Symmetry: C2
Subunit: 806 residues, 2 copies
């Protein structure tokens, strides 16, 4: 009944906004958690049984409210929308931001009252009411969005505070679905607030449907192609063409330029650059206006500074510089007053507002409180504020603006930013504070060599996660200007060939010093191909390469072999949890042996190989001497490599300090090979047999291998076995005879009380080992514990026994 | 050929292609040498000096992503001159590589079998580049390819370069207007480019073979042969074609369709 008249009211509201019906191209909805707006709210019992809500996210400044409006209008018109709901209410929190305690507020234009009590009565059985609330970022006040002190009534007819009524309605007993839109700046207030929500990311213009948007916005022949292709030829503005606000601002910003002609791609570098160009294009024939711009400026920023984003139909402006210039501004900014639809005046998406806030400090307060208040929830995240601040403080733009606007700008702020950078260098709580990514954004937006160098000097290690090509470009820019950065860990979240090629040609300029990690990231088929050509040029390159759990396959093998040949700087290279099945281990080993490489570590842990390559491992181990640390950790090998295992070290001068081992098969032969290596090979410091089906006879012949004196074997381990409690006695006695090792571990070994009793006696009398011993997971009787706890305090030679549980 | 085979052989055979001074051809047919084993193949070929003559990658499930490596090894080596890539899973987007294989003379690649390709125009443009530039390029076995009238038109435009020595040629599958064949015949008349040609599943119409038989009738364009198969064309075409060979045996044979 009530549905129909307001579905036409919302149609009238969102049809006129620009149109925008034939002016829209679909953006991308993504939920990875390692889309289709239709049936967005499955409560299906896969992973989302009790959920009631979703949060929209995405890149900075999608116009997100526009997408909320598109969903609203799409339901209002239907368009194959199976009506799971009877009402979707658009909340424009940019207005609801007031401190006034308001009840259920379904009226907006103050029309005749909605049937509020029968609306409450059509609640209990059908949960077909939904509230599309938007602009959560603009809940103003005192940045007080913590847990609500007092709840509200279910009837919602009480005019309680939205802090104390609406928020708790979201919190407990919501009874309706929920979709909120905001940026990931400082939301956790609402997420440590229990909601059991999901989140979905929104992604802007890809190339093809950005071209579609250009065709739909422009006329099909006047500027649909030539402008598109001329800005394609720009090495930039295609990085930002992904962002929808940039596309909307270049589409609206270029229809004024055919009257001028051939002034499209000029002075287009960064978001600040394009915003300044667009503002200058709008304000070209205005100069009189020198005071009008200053008057509007010195008042716009207070919308978020004093945190009154709403201007009250611009009555504060009526105080400050109210002339026909205001009419001109509204005429060129049609989306200022019309969105409120009754009396009220505002800005489009507060982005030009933050640009005017940057203008404020450009013209002439104190920078101390702003930088202290950076990213908070009182002055409005300051994200785009500081973004434009950095974009402007570029010295060439400084001179241009100080000449254009007849304004003095302070250079102290540059130092202030510097100070800020050391502070966030020393801020250890980087998980819940602004990341390194927006710092990279800013330093890129300000394009100063020495300043970027000094900013990077405070950071010896980088942790970022790329989402936009803008992220790729800013990362490339900052990293190619680093000298005090050691480790470079990068998070790829997907062409990538040229991106990472730039990312590590930055390392080709990082010849001062660098270290690299690329772990838990899926390097594609050319993802293998990156960093190979990068390591293929001489100079100063990475001392230590990491590829662990990365999306990786056989293809990398030849590549890395090549770089292992051409590299004179790598000392270790890790290949962990990556599907380097087999015969790529052959490519690895041929790359290692063929040239002379200064490789130190070599980790093949959990690489699904077999014994059929161990012979090649032994060949390369015999050939090379630089390699001395060779983990093959508990991959899919075992027995039948045993002869190879032995003949790796059949002679001295092998130089293999540690040798991690594998979940093996038939114990006897492999441990016999281990005895051969132990009795013959020098400087064999570790032997990490772990989680292995090794028997009592196996470990017995192992200690027989220890019987060879003058064998220097440090820390050793036998994890899993079932021995008679004399074998441990043999190993302890043989340590007493010769101080072979330093510590040992016994893991899931079922040994019995008498075992540790013999252990503690033999260590009690001039202890066998001299450093440590580790015992875990036994339910043995407690007089063993008393003996063990006794012995260390009288003799600290056995510095520690790992206590089981007590 | 058709042997149970996979990527592993690639490095192996590269090694023996390096250490062998007796092999002159090596065939890898119908065997699942998918990709990057073609890289192992090509590095084995180029790294040492090998007296390899044939190289068949027919029906090996590769993509354009290795064609660049094929071109590199082809440029490096000169012994290899007979390189079938027969109708495997490549096509367009290798086109620039296809051209730059033979972008200069002294490539020494006599025959070059081709593949069921994709976008005709660019690949046949590369074919025109090779035809106009490369010497001793004797065959070009485009077969069962989605090649268009514009494609084969620019191909005969590639034939327009005189002094280009291209022997036996083939265009198997296409749908042309019956003046394109006239252009190729006239350009053969202008310069004795090739010796024979095949037209396979080409739907050409009666007028096509009529123009063909007239132009061959008057000082025949080709000099060796011509093969036509699977047409249901009207029979006065057959009478003209059966007539012309007995008076002029220059066109030694036209493959009779069914009668």
């Amino acid at each position: 009944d009530y549905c129909k008249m307001y579905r036409r009211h919302v149609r009238s509201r969102f049809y006129s906004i620009k149109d925008l019906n034939s002016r829209y191209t679909q953006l991308q909805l993504v939920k990875e958690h390692p889309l289709k707006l239709e049936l967005l709210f499955e409560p299906e019992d896969g992973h989302s049984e009790p959920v009631h809500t979703v949060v929209f996210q995405g890149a900075a400044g999608i116009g997100k409210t526009i997408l909320a409006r598109k969903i609203m209008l799409d339901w209002a018109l239907g368009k194959l929308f199976k009506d799971k709901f009877d009402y979707l209410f658009f909340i424009h929190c940019r207005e609801v931001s007031l401190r006034t305690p308001r009840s259920l507020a379904d009226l907006i234009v103050s029309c005749w009252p909605d049937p509020n009590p029968p609306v409450c009565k059509i609640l209990r059985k059908p949960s077909r009411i939904l509230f599309l609330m938007d602009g959560f970022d603009e809940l103003q006040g005192a940045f007080d969005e913590h847990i609500g002190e007092v709840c509200t009534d279910w009837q919602k007819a009480v005019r309680g505070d939205i802090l104390l009524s609406s928020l708790i309605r979201k919190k407990l007993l919501p009874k309706a679905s929920l979709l909120i839109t905001t940026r990931p700046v400082a939301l956790e207030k609402l997420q440590h607030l229990l909601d059991h929500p999901r989140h979905v990311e929104i992604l802007g213009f890809s190339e093809a449907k950005r071209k579609e948007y250009f065709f739909k916005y422009f006329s099909n022949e006047l500027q649909a192609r030539e402008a598109f292709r001329l800005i394609q030829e720009n090495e930039v503005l295609f990085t930002m063409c992904f962002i929808p606000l940039v596309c909307w601002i270049v589409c609206t910003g270029l229809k004024q330029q055919m009257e001028t002609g051939k002034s499209l791609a000029q002075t287009s570098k960064t978001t600040t650059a394009v915003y300044v160009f667009f503002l200058s294009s709008l304000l070209q024939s205005r100069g009189l206006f020198s005071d009008y711009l200053q008057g509007l400026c010195s008042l716009a920023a207070d919308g978020i500074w004093n945190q009154k984003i709403l201007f009250e139909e611009c009555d504060l402006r009526k105080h400050g510089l109210q002339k026909t210039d205001v009419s001109a501004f509204l005429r060129m900014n049609v989306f200022q007053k019309e969105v409120d639809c009754e009396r009220f005046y505002s800005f489009s998406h507060m982005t030009f507002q933050e640009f005017f806030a940057a203008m404020y400090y450009l013209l002439e307060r104190d920078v101390k409180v702003l930088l202290e208040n950076y990213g908070k929830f009182e002055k409005g995240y300051l994200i785009f504020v500081v973004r434009f601040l950095f974009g402007l403080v570029n010295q060439e733009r400084t001179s241009y603006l100080e000449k254009k606007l007849s304004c003095k700008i302070s250079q102290q702020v540059r130092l202030e930013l510097l100070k800020w950078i050391e502070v966030k260098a020393k801020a250890k709580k980087l998980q819940w504070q602004p990341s390194q990514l927006e710092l990279f954004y800013c330093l890129y937006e300000m394009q100063e060599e020495d300043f970027v160098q000094s900013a990077m000097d405070h950071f010896p290690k980088i942790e970022i996660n790329l989402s936009t090509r803008m992220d790729h470009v800013v990362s490339s820019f900052c990293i190619k200007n680093c000298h005090r950065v050691k480790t470079l860990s990068l998070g790829f979240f997907h062409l990538t060939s040229s991106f990472c090629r730039g990312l590590f040609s930055s390392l080709s300029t990082n010849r001062s010093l660098t270290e690299l990690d690329l772990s838990d990231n899926t390097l594609g088929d050319p993802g293998m191909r990156v960093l190979c050509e990068a390591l293929q040029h001489p100079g100063c390159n990475i001392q230590r390469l990491w590829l662990g759990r990365c999306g990786l396959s056989h293809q990398c093998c030849f590549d890395i072999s090549s770089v292992l040949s051409s590299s004179q700087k790598l000392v270790e290279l890790d290949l962990s949890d990556n599907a380097l099945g087999d015969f790529g281990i052959r490519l690895l080993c041929v790359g290692l042996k063929h040239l002379l490489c200064n490789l130190q570590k070599l980790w093949l842990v959990s690489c699904c190989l077999t014994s059929a390559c161990c012979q090649d491992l032994a060949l390369v181990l015999s050939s090379n001497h630089s390699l001395t640390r060779l983990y093959i950790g508990e991959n899919a090998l075992g027995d039948s490599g045993v002869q190879v295992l032995c003949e790796k070290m059949k002679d001295p001068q092998c130089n293999l300090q540690k040798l991690g081992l594998v979940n093996s098969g038939l114990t006897s032969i492999c441990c016999s090979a281990l005895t051969s290596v132990l009795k013959t090979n020098q400087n064999f410091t570790h032997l990490y047999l772990r989680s292995n089906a090794l028997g009592d006879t196996g470990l017995r012949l192992l200690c027989e291998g220890l019987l060879h004196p003058d064998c220097k074997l440090q820390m050793l381990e036998l994890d899993n076995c079932s021995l008679t409690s004399h074998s441990c006695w043999n190993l302890s006695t043989i340590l007493t005879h010769n101080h072979s090792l330093r510590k040992l571990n016994l893991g899931n070994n079922d040994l019995g009380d008498l075992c540790v009793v013999t252990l503690c006696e033999v260590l009690k009398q001039q202890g066998c080992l001299l450093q440590s011993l580790q015992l875990g997971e036994m339910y043995l009787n407690r007089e063993t514990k008393r003996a063990l706890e006794a012995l260390q305090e009288e003799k600290p030679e056995l510095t520690i026994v790992f206590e089981i549980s007590w």
